[PDB]
Amino acid sequence: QAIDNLRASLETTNQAIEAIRQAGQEMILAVQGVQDYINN
Amino acid sequence: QAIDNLRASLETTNQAIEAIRQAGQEMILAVQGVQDYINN
Amino acid sequence: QAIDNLRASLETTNQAIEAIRQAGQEMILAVQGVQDYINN
Amino acid sequence: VEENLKKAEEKLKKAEELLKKSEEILKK
Amino acid sequence: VEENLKKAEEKLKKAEELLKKSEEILKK
Amino acid sequence: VEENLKKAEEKLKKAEELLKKSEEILKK
Numbered sequence A, B, C: 001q002a003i004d005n006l007r008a009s010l011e012t013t014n015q016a017i018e019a020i021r022q023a024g025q026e027m028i029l030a031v032q033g034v035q036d037y038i039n040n
Numbered sequence D, E, F: 001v002e003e004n005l006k007k008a009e010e011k012l013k014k015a016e017e018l019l020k021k022s023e024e025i026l027k028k
Helices: A004-036 B001-037 C002-038 D003-028 E002-028 F002-027
Strands: none
Touching: A004 B001, A004 C002, A004 D003, A004 E002, B001 C002, B001 D003, B001 F002, C002 E002, C002 F002
């Protein structure tokens, strides 16, 4: 069960990382949006 | 002990992720600060 | 082998985090580049 | 830009929730 | 700025690849 | 904005330190 517990923790951690990765893609679009507006 | 070693590693990894997550919150404030200044 | 499997997964996860961390350093340079251009 | 930053903030909050869940599983 | 955002996008794509690999190892 | 980017850079450096520590624990 201790092995299963670690596996469930690491699954959860990977989901957290994926949420940060998607936040990063939104921040690239935000910086792109600022750069677009000052170059309009 | 190998199970305990993995657990300590994953604890450490989670702390690293939390540092990146907080860096992300500071980058949102930075992009907000740029957007605020060009809209002043 | 289940312990070895978790270890290989966590190694892989740590590499993913490091890629996000480096993406963060590039995004700081991007926001710096925008801030530099509006202050030129 | 504000919509993109809102969506980013939402995803960072979900990441925090998931990290606390990971930590709680590890405690067991 | 565009080069920095390109490099960031490349690293986020490598992170996604590595997360899918991690998930596949866990399934085993 | 410069203070926010400084704080972000500090947190990214702490993350690198913690990842190297995680890797060192795994080696054991």
